[PDB]
């Protein structure tokens, strides 16, 4: 590694280089699979040294070399919890991270381990699973719908099937990641679909995703394009679960599409007394729904779909009912 | 009736609703725009307490108070100290971005301040602390046992330390 | 054969010298000897005899005196030396003596902080011993949710503890046999603390976690105290209690080993202050 680090090593040196590459694959396949019985040393030097040939050797390694140990490393991601350290799995993970972000590497190869980043998603190590979140996350912004349809979706499914502290990362980066790679258009029904669902553990997380997309759009020229989507999604708000969990959900969305600077930053508020149907609940249910009605509601007319869909299930006692009262007048 | 109040006067009517709804049911068997100060209102009744439940969140309502009205809103007793440690942290987290932290000034000049306030009330002359026989100065060792046997004060001293 | 002894008196005398590097040295130049002999035996014993010479010297190299120029550099010789002689002896049968050789390791790299390979090691012992010694395996697989705990990872602790408390249940036994019961015990209460911890979601809560957690909503093989204040910890992390987890902290310490209070105090951190908000 000292020695062709950045010597600018002589043509008449380029006897070494394929010595070092025969001894890099010649001991990298007998080890590629049961890696967890041999020296755990051994096999990070390696992976180091092959690392660094293809990013500042790229030319002194035939192609096959590059090609032939990003599979040979992949088998070792693709490794079970014990056929694989999770020192071994996260040194070639961010190792080949390196390798893509760094545009050395070759057109053929490049997209020969993005392929390998989606897989490696969905294991049950949270760690593991963070980890090729990362890689994934750069092997997509390096290239930039036809395939990011798939790659948000295995983002969603993280918050469903991931533990609190693995769900709350996803949730925390998915508002710029639809910012980016999606028109607020391609991907909104997803958003609001994943925020109120029976399939969704954590539905307190998903609150500050729809409030940052939310927000990401009436700040940035598309104050009414929130208004169609909330009068459209209302009535699915309306059906959902308990009815305290819809009413708690129908008033953390009006929180989102809340223009007004003191209603918009009381979502955490909301979150924090989750399932919780006091008098100050419904009280705050039924004020910022007002907000959202008397102060930015689209039109004079618009407010009869909003009048006509609420008055559904508008019971003796429920906040619903209570809402009409003040709505009314 | 005093049943029901003293259910009600504590959080056990609220704990256990189902046996409440059973006692009253017995019982009866026997024959505004939403500005600023709403704002600063509502945190004001999250975040003047003693619950820990909830710090995250109580981090960032009192994060949008405006900055002028920050300092007055932690100087103030009643103010969940155990909010200062979320406090600081949210605060150097947009620090770490570049922007300037109305939160974690704010925060820091209360923790030292809250700091530098309950070392007013150490002994003016301080000496080795024995765990084995505290007791050969007399009034020293008595101000120490008053001092960290108090509830109010012994539970400050972790909360202001995190 | 005579060179064989040769070696043998020259890493003993090397030994007392206590240059025991190059002891180690002629202990695997004994083995080579051995293998010239096909002597399995002799040869294991001359390979775990220079792999605990190569253990001593990165134990004096770290643990007597804590030089910072050490890079583990004899570890890697200690290893491949065991790596070798557990080869041996799977090729000449006798799993129990390479489980051995995997425990020593296991306990080695333990002791020099690497959790996640002295885990690893444990576990590969306890996949060696699960055929014919059950509670050896147990005890070893312990130690690996030890190591695992160490290296703070808490899903693969709880896997580890699961299958220590399958393993226990269909190989002790209804009721456990006392030696397999304490084993039970640290499992439930290590499994319970666990899942208080991590709170599975529904898609990752396995049937065993689900059963578990609805015992604690009577008492197996826990003392009634102990059971309780169990119980009481369950509903207050699910009811969202602060207070009631302080007050259970402080009142199940003398009752739990310190791994389980760390646990106990891990689950009451996540509760007050929550990971991965990033703040």
Same mark, same amino acid.
């Given at each position: &590694?000292?020695? *062709? +680090?950045?010597? !600018? $090593?002589?043509?008449?040196a380029?006897? =070494?280089?394929?010595?070092?590459?025969?001894? /890099?694959?010649?001991?990298?396949?007998?080890?590629?699979?049961?890696?967890?019985?041999?020296?755990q040393?051994?096999?990070?030097?390696?992976?180091?040294?092959?690392?660094?040939?293809?990013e500042?050797?790229?030319?002194?390694?035939?192609?096959?070399?590059?090609?032939?140990?990003?599979?040979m490393?992949?088998?070792?991601?693709?490794?079970?919890?014990?056929?694989?350290?999770?020192?071994?799995?996260?040194?070639? &993970?961010?190792? *080949? +991270?390196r390798? !893509? $972000?760094?545009?050395?590497?070759?057109? =053929?190869?490049?997209?020969?381990?993005?392929? /390998?980043?989606?897989?490696?998603?969905?294991?049950?190590?949270?760690?593991?699973a963070?980890?090729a979140?990362?890689?994934?996350?750069?092997?997509?912004?390096?290239?930039?719908?036809?395939?990011?349809?798939?790659?948000?979706?295995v983002?969603?499914?993280?918050?469903?099937?991931?533990?609190?502290?693995?769900?709350?990362?996803?949730?925390?980066?998915?508002?710029?990641?639809?910012?980016?790679?999606?028109?607020?258009?391609?991907?909104?029904?997803?958003?609001?679909?994943?925020?109120?669902?029976?399939?969704?553990?954590?539905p307190?997380?998903?609150?500050?995703?729809?409030?940052?997309?939310?927000?990401?759009?009436?700040?940035?020229?598309?104050?009414?394009?929130?208004?169609?989507w909330?009068?459209?999604?209302?009535?699915?708000?309306?059906?959902?679960?308990?009815?305290?969990?819809?009413?708690?959900?129908?008033?953390?969305?009006?929180?989102?599409?809340?223009?007004?600077?003191?209603?918009?930053?009381?979502?955490?508020?909301?979150?924090?007394?989750?399932?919780?149907?006091?008098?100050?609940?419904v009280?705050?249910?039924?004020?910022?729904?007002?907000?959202?009605y008397?102060?930015?509601?689209?039109?004079?007319?618009?407010?009869?779909?909003?009048?006509?869909?609420?008055?559904?299930?508008?019971?003796?006692?429920?906040?619903?009912?209570?809402?009409?009262?003040?709505?009314?007048? | 009736?005093?049943?029901?109040?003293?259910?009600?006067s504590?959080?056990?009517?609220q704990?256990?609703?189902?046996?409440?709804?059973?006692?009253?049911?017995?019982?009866?068997?026997?024959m505004?725009?939403?500005?600023?100060?709403?704002?600063?209102?509502?945190?004001?009744?999250?975040?003047?307490?003693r619950?820990?439940?909830?710090?995250?969140?109580?981090?960032?309502?009192?994060?949008?108070?405006?900055?002028?009205d920050?300092?007055?809103?932690?100087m103030?007793?009643?103010?969940?100290?155990?909010?200062?440690?979320?406090?600081?942290?949210?605060?150097?987290?947009?620090?770490?971005?570049?922007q300037?932290?109305?939160?974690?000034?704010?925060?820091?000049?209360?923790?030292?301040?809250?700091?530098?306030?309950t070392?007013?009330?150490?002994?003016?002359?301080?000496?080795?602390?024995?765990?084995?026989l505290?007791?050969?100065?007399?009034?020293?060792?008595?101000?120490?046992?008053?001092?960290?046997?108090?509830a109010?004060?012994?539970?400050?001293?972790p909360?202001?330390?995190? | 054969a005579?060179?064989?002894?040769?070696?043998?008196?020259?890493?003993?005398?090397?030994?007392?010298?206590?240059?025991?590097?190059?002891?180690?040295?002629?202990?695997?130049?004994?083995?080579?000897?051995?293998?010239?002999?096909?002597?399995?035996p002799?040869?294991?014993?001359?390979?775990?005899?220079?792999?605990?010479?190569?253990?001593?010297q990165?134990?004096?190299?770290?643990?007597?005196?804590?030089?910072?120029?050490?890079?583990?550099?004899?570890?890697?010789?200690?290893?491949?030396?065991?790596?070798?002689?557990?080869?041996?002896?799977?090729?000449?049968?006798?799993?129990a003596?390479?489980?051995?050789?995997?425990?020593?390791?296991?306990?080695?790299?333990?002791?020099?902080?690497?959790?996640?390979?002295?885990?690893?090691?444990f576990?590969?012992?306890?996949?060696?011993?699960?055929?014919?010694?059950?509670?050896?395996?147990?005890?070893?697989?312990?130690?690996?949710?030890?190591?695992?705990?160490?290296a703070?990872?808490?899903?693969?602790?709880?896997?580890?503890?699961?299958?220590?408390?399958?393993?226990?249940?269909?190989?002790?036994?209804?009721?456990?046999?006392?030696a397999?019961s304490?084993?039970?015990?640290?499992?439930?209460?290590?499994?319970?603390?666990?899942?208080?911890?991590?709170?599975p979601?529904?898609?990752?809560?396995?049937?065993?976690?689900?059963?578990?957690?609805?015992?604690?909503?009577?008492?197996?093989?826990?003392?009634?105290?102990?059971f309780?204040?169990?119980?009481?910890?369950?509903?207050?992390?699910?009811?969202?209690?602060?207070?009631?987890?302080?007050?259970?902290q402080?009142?199940?310490?003398?009752?739990?080993?310190?791994?389980?209070?760390?646990?106990?105090?891990?689950?009451?951190?996540?509760?007050?202050?929550?990971?991965?908000?990033?703040?």
């Amino acid at each position: &590694l000292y020695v *062709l +680090e950045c010597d !600018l $090593l002589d043509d008449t040196a380029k006897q =070494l280089i394929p010595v070092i590459s025969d001894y /890099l694959l010649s001991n990298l396949k007998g080890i590629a699979h049961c890696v967890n019985i041999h020296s755990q040393q051994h096999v990070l030097v390696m992976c180091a040294t092959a690392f660094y040939l293809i990013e500042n050797y790229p030319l002194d390694v035939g192609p096959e070399f590059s090609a032939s140990i990003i599979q040979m490393c992949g088998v070792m991601l693709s490794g079970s919890e014990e056929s694989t350290p999770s020192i071994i799995y996260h040194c070639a &993970l961010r190792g *080949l +991270e390196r390798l !893509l $972000l760094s545009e050395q590497l070759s057109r =053929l190869d490049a997209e020969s381990l993005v392929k /390998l980043s989606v897989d490696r998603v969905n294991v049950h190590s949270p760690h593991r699973a963070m980890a090729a979140l990362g890689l994934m996350l750069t092997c997509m912004y390096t290239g930039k719908v036809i395939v990011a349809m798939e790659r948000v979706s295995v983002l969603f499914d993280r918050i469903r099937k991931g533990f609190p502290c693995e769900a709350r990362v996803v949730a925390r980066i998915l508002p710029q990641f639809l910012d980016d790679f999606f028109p607020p258009q391609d991907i909104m029904n997803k958003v609001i679909g994943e925020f109120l669902s029976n399939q969704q553990p954590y539905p307190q997380f998903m609150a500050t995703v729809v409030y940052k997309v939310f927000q990401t759009l009436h700040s940035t020229g598309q104050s009414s394009m929130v208004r169609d989507w909330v009068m459209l999604s209302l009535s699915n708000f309306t059906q959902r679960a308990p009815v305290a969990m819809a009413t708690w959900s129908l008033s953390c969305f009006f929180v989102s599409a809340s223009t007004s600077p003191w209603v918009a930053a009381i979502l955490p508020h909301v979150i924090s007394r989750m399932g919780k149907l006091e008098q100050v609940d419904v009280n705050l249910f039924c004020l910022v729904a007002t907000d959202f009605y008397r102060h930015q509601i689209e039109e004079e007319l618009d407010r009869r779909a909003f009048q006509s869909v609420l008055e559904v299930v508008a019971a003796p006692g429920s906040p619903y009912h209570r809402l009409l009262t003040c709505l009314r007048n | 009736n005093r049943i029901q109040e003293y259910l009600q006067s504590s959080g056990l009517a609220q704990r256990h609703q189902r046996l409440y709804s059973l006692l009253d049911r017995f019982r009866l068997s026997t024959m505004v725009s939403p500005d600023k100060d709403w704002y600063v209102h509502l945190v004001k009744s999250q975040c003047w307490t003693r619950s820990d439940s909830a710090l995250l969140e109580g981090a960032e309502l009192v994060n949008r108070i405006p900055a002028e009205d920050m300092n007055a809103f932690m100087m103030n007793s009643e103010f969940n100290l155990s909010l200062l440690a979320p406090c600081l942290s949210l605060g150097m987290s947009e620090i770490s971005g570049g922007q300037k932290s109305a939160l974690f000034e704010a925060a820091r000049e209360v923790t030292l301040a809250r700091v530098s306030g309950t070392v007013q009330q150490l002994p003016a002359v301080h000496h080795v602390f024995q765990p084995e026989l505290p007791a050969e100065p007399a009034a020293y060792w008595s101000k120490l046992n008053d001092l960290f046997g108090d509830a109010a004060l012994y539970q400050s001293l972790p909360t202001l330390a995190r | 054969a005579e060179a064989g002894e040769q070696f043998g008196q020259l890493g003993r005398e090397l030994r007392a010298q206590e240059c025991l590097p190059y002891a180690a040295w002629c202990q695997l130049a004994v083995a080579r000897c051995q293998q010239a002999l096909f002597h399995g035996p002799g040869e294991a014993l001359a390979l775990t005899e220079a792999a605990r010479l190569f253990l001593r010297q990165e134990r004096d190299a770290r643990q007597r005196l804590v030089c910072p120029a050490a890079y583990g550099e004899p570890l890697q010789a200690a290893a491949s030396a065991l790596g070798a002689a557990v080869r041996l002896h799977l090729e000449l049968g006798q799993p129990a003596a390479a489980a051995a050789l995997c425990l020593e390791l296991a306990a080695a790299l333990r002791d020099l902080g690497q959790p996640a390979a002295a885990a690893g090691h444990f576990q590969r012992a306890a996949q060696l011993q699960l055929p014919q010694l059950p509670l050896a395996a147990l005890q070893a697989l312990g130690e690996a949710a030890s190591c695992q705990l160490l290296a703070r990872d808490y899903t693969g602790a709880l896997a580890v503890f699961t299958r220590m408390q399958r393993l226990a249940r269909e190989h002790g036994s209804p009721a456990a046999l006392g030696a397999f019961s304490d084993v039970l015990v640290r499992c439930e209460v290590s499994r319970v603390l666990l899942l208080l911890l991590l709170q599975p979601p529904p898609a990752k809560l396995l049937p065993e976690h689900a059963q578990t957690l609805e015992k604690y909503s009577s008492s197996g093989q826990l003392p009634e105290e102990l059971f309780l204040l169990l119980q009481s910890l369950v509903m207050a992390t699910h009811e969202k209690d602060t207070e009631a987890i302080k007050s259970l902290q402080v009142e199940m310490w003398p009752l739990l080993t310190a791994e389980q209070n760390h646990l106990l105090h891990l689950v009451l951190q996540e509760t007050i202050s929550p990971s991965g908000q990033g703040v």
